[PDB]
Design a protein around this nucleic acid. Structure first.
Lengths: 83, 141, 240, 53, 65, 167
RNA sequence: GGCGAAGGCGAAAACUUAGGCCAUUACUGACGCUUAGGCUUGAAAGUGUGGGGAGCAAAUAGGAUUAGAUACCCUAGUAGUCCACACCGUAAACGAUAGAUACUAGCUGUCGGGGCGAUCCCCUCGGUAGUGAAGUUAACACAUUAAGUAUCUCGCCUGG
C-alpha cells in the first residue's frame, strides 16, 4: 500500500529525524519508484501518474531547499534532481 | 487563563489580523486571536492607547515555539464596536512606506494611522512631528 | 419586596431544537441539546429594570398596553389584569393599521360605539340575519382592533407574550418612539425589545407571574394596590 | 415473480412486486443516455425522500 | 433503520452471516432500500456487494424472478 | 492479511474425488500453506453455473499474500474440476483496533438484548438509555501560559441598555 | 452516500496502488504558496488499424401524415455504439463560483474516523447538505462547503 514505516525507519537516522527533510525526500523517491512500478503494471491509472508528477515537483522543491540549507546534500548525491 | 483557537501562518500576520478583525465586525464577536510579533505588539499597544481597540494579551507556549496574541474590541453596552474600519497597509506583495511629511489624518482629521519608522513605531501625528518616516502598518479610524 | 426572586422558580425550558443563537448571549450558555433553561439572577435584574422603568414611564401619565394573544392563558390573565388595573387588553391582535394611521383606529372605535348604541336602541325591526350581522360587526371590530375599541388615545407602551408572535404589534410599536418591553423566550429574536426579559411562557406559572408583575408595576404607577412581589405565594394555574 | 397456492390473495400480494419488476425491466428496454435516466430517477427518489422526511 | 454493526460483525462475508444479508433479500433478486432498512454507507456496501456476491456464486437468484 | 477461500466444485461428486480435486487445487495454489480440505457440504446452487444444479462447497482458512492470489484465482477458474473460486481478504471494512473490535462485546450484549427473555424491555436497537457523557470530548485546546497581560480588563455582558432615565 | 484532480467511479469476486478521515509541543526547521512559459491527463463523437458485431440507430431508403418527411410513426438499415492502439484532447469538463491559505449566529440531516458505552444516546473533527443571522450580489439569491471575510499567484473582461 503506502509502503510507509519501513522506508521511514530506514531513512530515520536518529529519533531526531522522524519528519525531517531526509525522510520526506526518501519517501517521495520511494513513492516515485513504487508508482512507476504500479502504473507500469496498471496503465490507465491516471491518478497514479498525476500523483507521480506532483511528487516529482515536491521532490524538486525539497532538493532545492536541501541544497540551500545544507551544502553536503550534493556531495553524497544519491538523489539527483533529474526526473 | 486559556486562550483557544490558535492560528498558524496564513500567509502573513497582517492579513491574518485583518480577516479576524473583519470577522469580529461581521459576527459581532468580542475577542479574537492572531499571530504575535514585535510590530503586532507595538500596533496593538498603540491601538489600545488610541481607543479604537480594547486591550490585548500576548501569550507564548514556552518560546518561539508558539507566540500568539488575543485581542478584544472596545464595545459600549450596546454591542457597538469602537472599530469603524481598519485597513492593513504593510503587505508582503507590496511593501508600502511613506515619509514623515506625507502622512494624512484619517476619518475627518480624527483617524490615526500607525507608522513604523527608522527608529520606532508610533502614531501619524507624532510621526510627522518626529521628522522620521517609514512603513505604515494600519490605517485606523 | 419588588420583583422577588421567589417568582423565578419555573421560568425554564420550552420547545427544544428551535432557538435563536443570539439569545445565548442574553440568557446563558445553552447546551447542544438546546437547554432552554434561564438564569435566575440576570433574568431577575432585567425584570426589575423593566418593572421600575415602566413604573416611571406610567408615572409620566403614559399607558402600558397589555397584550394577550397566546392560546387562552395569556389572554385570560391579561383580561384579569384589565379588570384589576385600568389598562387596555387584547382578546385578538389588531390586524395592523392602528398608530401610524390614527384615522383607522378612530373609525373602528366609533363604529363599535355606534354598534353598541344601535344594539341598545332598536331590536324589534331587526331580523335574525340582521342581528347576526350586527353582532358579527361588533365582534369583528373588537378583534380587528383590540387595543383600540372604545378609546382613541395612542398607547405609550405595549407588551406581548412574544415580540416575534405579532407582526402588527411590532409594526405599531416601532412606529412610535416608545420603550417596548415584552416577555421574551429563547426561540425569540431579542432585537425587538428595549429590556429583554429572558423567561419561560410554556410553563404557565412563569408567564402568569411575569405579566402579573408587569400589572403590579403599572398599578403602583397608577396608585392602586399591587399583589405579586408583595405576597410570597406563587400562583399555580395550568396554561388554559 | 411467483406467488403460489392462492387464486386471488397471493395473486393480490403478487401484483405489486410483479408490476415493480415489470417497470424495472421496462425502463431497461430502450436505449437512453445516463443523463435523463439518472436525473429523473433521482428526482423521483428525492420526491419520495421529501415525502418521507 | 440501522441493521448492520448491531446484528452483524462489521466484517461481512457470505458464510456465517448470510441470514442478515438475506433479510434484505427475497428469491426475486432485489435488495431492501434505505426507506425500509436505513443502513449506513458501509452497511449498504455490505448488503449490496455480499448479496450480489451470493447471487454471483449461485447461492440466491442472480436475476431470476 | 488472511484469505478466506471458498471453492464450489463440480456437481454431486463423491467426497473422496472432490477432496482429490481440492488437493490438486492446493497443488496449483501458490498462496500460504496450512489450508486443509474442509467440506462445507453439497449445497444447491441457485442456478447451473455451467450445468451443475448443486455444487460441493469447500472452505479454506489461512493467511494471504499480495502477488500470489490472482494467478491462483484464474487457474482455479480455468480448472474445470472446480466451478467457482471466490476469495476473501482480511480487509473488507472492519477494525484492527483494541477499542473498536472489543466493542463487539457490546454487540454480543446487543444480541442478548435483542430478545426479551423477561417481562422487562431492553429491545428496540437505537433506544437511548443515555449511559455515556464521556469519551474523547477533546479538540486539544491550546494551553495558555501568561507572558504579558496588557490591561487585563476586558469588557463583558453588554446588556440592552439605552436612555436609562426617562421619568 | 463516500472517493477520485476534472474527465468519473454501481453483477460480483481478488490483487498493485494514488489518495483519504481522526489526534498527535511529537521531526527538517519556512523546507512554503500558487502559477504566464512548461509537464501529464483529458467524456465523447468520428478516423483508420484486427476480430467478432448481439442489437440498433447518422447517413440512406418505403409506407403514412403533412403544405412536404432523410422531423415527430415504424420497418430495412451502415459508420458507430464493443474492445486493443494512437489522434481526435472539445463538453451543459459550468457551481457558467480558480489553486494554496486562515477566520464568520445558529439550526436541522447524513457518511467516515477517534473515545465511550445492550444497541443507543452523546462528544470530536472533517466530509457531505440545507433555511437563515451577519455579510454579500441592481435583482434573482449565496450564506460555515458563500456569491461572507481576507493574503500569494495566475486565467478570463468593455457596446451589438
Amino acid at each position: 500500500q503506502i509502503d510507509k514505516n519501513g522506508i521511514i525507519k530506514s531513512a530515520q537516522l536518529h529519533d531526531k529525524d522522524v519528519g525531517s527533510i531526509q525522510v520526506q525526500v526518501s519517501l517521495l523517491t520511494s513513492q516515485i519508484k513504487q508508482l512507476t512500478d504500479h502504473l507500469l503494471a496498471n496503465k490507465k491509472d491516471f491518478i497514479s501518474k498525476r500523483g507521480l508528477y506532483a511528487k516529482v515537483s515536491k521532490r524538486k522543491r525539497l532538493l532545492k531547499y536541501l541544497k540551500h540549507n545544507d551544502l553536503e546534500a550534493y556531495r553524497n548525491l544519491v538523489k539527483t534532481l533529474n526526473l | 487563563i486559556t486562550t483557544t483557537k490558535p492560528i498558524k501562518a496564513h500567509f502573513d500576520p497582517v492579513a491574518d489580523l485583518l480577516t479576524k478583525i473583519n470577522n469580529a465586525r461581521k459576527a459581532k464577536l468580542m475577542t479574537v486571536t492572531t499571530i504575535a510579533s514585535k510590530l503586532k505588539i507595538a500596533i496593538l499597544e498603540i491601538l489600545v492607547k488610541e481607543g479604537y481597540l480594547a486591550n490585548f494579551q500576548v501569550l507564548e507556549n514556552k518560546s518561539k515555539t508558539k507566540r500568539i496574541v488575543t485581542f478584544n474590541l472596545k464595545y459600549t453596552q450596546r454591542r457597538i464596536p469602537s472599530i469603524n474600519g481598519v485597513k492593513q497597509i504593510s503587505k508582503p506583495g507590496l511593501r508600502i512606506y511613506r515619509p514623515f511629511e506625507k502622512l494624512p489624518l484619517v476619518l475627518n482629521g480624527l483617524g490615526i494611522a500607525i507608522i513604523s519608522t527608522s527608529d520606532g513605531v508610533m502614531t501619524d501625528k507624532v510621526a510627522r512631528l518626529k521628522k522620521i518616516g517609514g512603513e505604515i502598518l494600519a490605517y485606523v479610524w | 419586596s419588588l420583583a422577588k426572586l421567589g417568582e423565578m422558580r419555573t421560568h425554564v425550558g420550552m420547545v427544544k431544537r428551535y432557538w435563536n443563537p443570539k439569545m445565548g448571549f442574553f440568557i446563558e450558555p445553552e447546551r447542544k441539546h438546546n437547554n432552554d433553561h434561564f438564569v435566575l439572577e440576570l433574568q431577575r435584574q432585567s425584570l426589575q429594570t423593566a418593572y421600575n422603568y415602566v413604573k416611571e414611564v406610567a408615572q409620566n401619565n403614559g399607558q402600558i398596553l397589555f397584550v394577550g394573544t397566546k392560546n387562552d392563558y395569556v389572554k385570560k390573565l391579561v383580561n384579569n389584569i384589565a379588570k384589576r388595573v385600568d389598562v387596555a387588553f387584547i382578546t385578538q391582535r389588531w390586524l395592523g393599521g392602528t398608530l401610524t394611521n390614527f384615522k383607522t383606529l378612530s373609525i373602528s372605535i366609533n363604529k363599535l360605539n355606534k354598534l353598541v348604541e344601535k344594539q341598545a336602541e332598536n331590536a324589534a325591526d331587526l331580523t335574525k340575519k340582521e342581528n347576526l350581522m350586527l353582532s358579527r360587526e361588533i365582534e369583528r371590530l373588537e378583534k380587528f382592533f383590540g387595543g383600540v375599541k372604545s378609546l382613541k388615545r395612542l398607547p405609550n407602551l405595549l407588551i406581548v407574550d412574544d415580540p416575534v408572535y405579532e407582526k402588527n404589534a411590532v409594526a405599531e410599536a416601532n412606529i412610535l418612539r416608545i420603550p417596548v418591553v415584552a416577555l421574551c423566550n429563547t426561540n425569540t429574536n431579542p432585537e425587538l425589545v428595549d429590556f429583554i426579559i429572558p423567561a419561560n411562557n410554556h410553563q404557565p406559572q412563569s408567564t402568569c407571574l411575569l405579566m402579573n408583575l408587569l400589572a403590579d408595576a403599572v398599578a403602583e404607577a397608577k396608585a392602586m394596590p399591587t399583589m405579586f412581589a408583595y405576597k410570597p405565594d406563587e400562583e399555580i394555574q395550568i396554561e388554559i | 415473480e411467483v406467488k403460489n397456492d392462492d387464486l386471488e390473495l397471493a395473486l393480490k400480494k403478487f401484483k405489486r412486486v410483479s408490476l415493480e419488476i415489470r417497470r424495472l425491466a421496462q425502463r431497461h428496454e430502450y436505449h437512453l443516455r445516463k443523463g435523463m435516466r439518472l436525473r429523473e430517477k433521482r428526482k423521483i427518489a428525492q420526491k419520495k425522500r421529501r415525502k418521507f422526511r | 433503520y440501522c441493521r448492520f454493526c448491531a446484528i452483524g460483525q462489521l466484517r461481512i462475508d457470505l458464510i456465517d452471516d448470510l441470514e442478515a444479508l438475506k433479510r434484505f433479500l427475497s428469491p426475486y433478486a432485489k435488495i431492501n432500500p434505505r426507506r425500509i432498512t436505513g443502513n449506513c454507507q458501509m452497511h449498504q456496501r455490505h448488503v449490496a456487494k455480499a448479496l450480489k456476491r451470493a447471487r454471483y456464486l449461485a447461492l440466491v437468484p442472480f436475476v431470476k424472478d | 492479511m488472511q484469505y478466506n477461500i471458498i471453492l464450489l466444485v463440480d456437481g454431486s461428486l463423491s467426497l473422496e474425488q472432490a477432496n482429490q480435486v481440492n488437493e490438486k487445487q492446493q497443488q496449483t495454489l501458490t498462496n500460504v500453506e496450512g489450508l486443509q480440505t474442509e467440506y462445507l457440504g453439497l449445497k444447491e446452487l441457485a442456478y447451473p453455473i455451467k450445468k451443475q444444479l448443486s455444487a460441493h462447497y469447500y472452505r479454506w482458512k489461512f493467511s494471504g499474500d499480495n502477488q500470489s492470489t490472482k494467478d491462483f484465482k484464474r487457474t482455479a477458474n480455468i480448472n474445470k474440476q472446480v466451478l467457482r473460486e471466490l476469495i476473501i481478504n482480511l480487509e473488507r471494512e472492519y477494525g484492527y483496533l483494541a477499542s473498536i473490535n472489543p466493542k463487539k462485546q457490546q454487540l454480543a450484549l446487543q444480541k442478548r438484548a435483542k430478545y426479551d427473555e423477561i417481562i422487562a424491555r431492553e429491545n428496540n436497537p437505537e433506544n437511548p438509555d443515555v449511559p455515556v457523557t464521556s469519551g474523547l470530548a477533546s479538540t486539544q485546546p491550546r494551553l495558555s501560559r501568561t507572558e504579558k497581560a496588557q490591561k487585563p480588563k476586558e469588557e463583558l455582558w453588554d446588556v440592552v441598555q439605552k436612555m436609562g432615565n426617562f421619568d
